[PDB]
Amino acid sequence: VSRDTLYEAVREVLHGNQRKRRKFLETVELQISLKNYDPQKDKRFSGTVRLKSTPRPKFSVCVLGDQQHCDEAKAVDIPHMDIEALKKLNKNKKLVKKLAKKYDAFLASESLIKQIPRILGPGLNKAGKFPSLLTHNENMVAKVDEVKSTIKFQMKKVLCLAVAVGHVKMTDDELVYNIHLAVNFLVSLLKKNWQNVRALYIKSTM
């Protein structure tokens, strides 16, 4: 997409903030719409947008990790949970789905994605849980802030998505850099070029 009309859209919603003055927490989003790709057919695109600002104020995160993910996690204030604690979660598929539905997206260590398909593989992708691996550097400080808001553009049984980006309190040029990342990643991820779109509503939430 071009950037001039996207500038016009972000100016009209930066001055459409005064139309709303939000209190259900200040965050906006955008939509993406596609025209003639069959929702039941192949060439399904499935990718992750790395985003650098995370303009979503309360991103809900937890970690699922082994030893040496204890003390640094307690000092960064993210709750830590062990393999026998996942056995405690596995003692019923009652509470674990509710905690994973209250939380948005997880991340987990190397050897616990080995144990997440015990009997709970199809239980956990029922709520869309593929926990993302850490590394051997063992520094999750702001790397979790980077892994969050990596928006999954995924094709499923109908032809549209919506992406959670933005608050007008942040700076405009970085916000349009975020929407630029989203739109050029999806235009590259599509089977054809930017002709496949209908429009873009980078609007307020409410």
Binding site: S2, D4, T5, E8, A9, K35, Q195
Partner: protein, 51 residues
Amino acid sequence: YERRAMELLKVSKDKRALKFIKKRVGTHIRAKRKREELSSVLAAMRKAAAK
């Protein structure tokens, strides 16, 4: 034919539009250039329409 080609590109029959432009102007390179500048002027009209 230029009006008919932007009318094809509005409905986003881009492959048939390029074939029709090839049948009109001749060489495929000139056809690609013609379709690109028709996409440019049609994008100019669309970016004029929102303001």
